[PDB]
């Protein structure tokens, strides 16, 4: 789901 990509991006840019 393309609408989930920015959520993933937000997560990996925290860690």
């Amino acid at each position: 789901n393309w609408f989930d990509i920015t959520n993933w991006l937000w997560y990996i840019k925290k860690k």
Partner: antibody
Amino acid sequence: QVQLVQSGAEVKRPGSSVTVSCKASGGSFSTYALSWVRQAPGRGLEWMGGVIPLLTITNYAPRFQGRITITADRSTSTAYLELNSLRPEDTAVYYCAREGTTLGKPIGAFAHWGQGTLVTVSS
Amino acid sequence: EIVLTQSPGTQSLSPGERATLSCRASQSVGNNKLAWYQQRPGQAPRLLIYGASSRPSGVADRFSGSGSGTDFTLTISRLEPEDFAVYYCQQYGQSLSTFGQGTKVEVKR
């Protein structure tokens, strides 16, 4: 606060191409999803497509695939919609919409809307 | 393509009355990625509910969303004069996002 400002209304000839712009301010441009939604006169909302600027990943609705281009420029925090081979049926208000946040966690749904751009296809 | 059905397309209701707006999906909506928008004439849509039941800050709590799978509901606990408007549901649980056709809440007299 996130503000989206679109280019002004335009009259386009049948068969021509239109470019609508949407300049953002007040948030992070590159890592949030930006979509385009149109609304024909007296009709409902229709999702056209979107872009994630940082990744240059677009996502188009099947019925516009091959006729639209969505691009982003982080140097000006501006997103662009191109729509080609215009017909009378394409007369609509075109909205840009950015997903909301809970620089926080994105929610997918469109919290932030431009003021709309009326594109009239006519001779 | 997920088809969202909003029926009926118009509801005639009195000020102060409860309103329940239905959105039925043709297949299960992934992760309940279901949103509701309000739109007044001359204005851009406004997000009321996301993720089926989550409410953005600033949105009145008389608006509530519920449901999952294929059955979703927007409830307006008590209609204020400004609540008479058009309401759209939207699913974004697939890459192809779709809107319902909208439901107009109008004043019964």
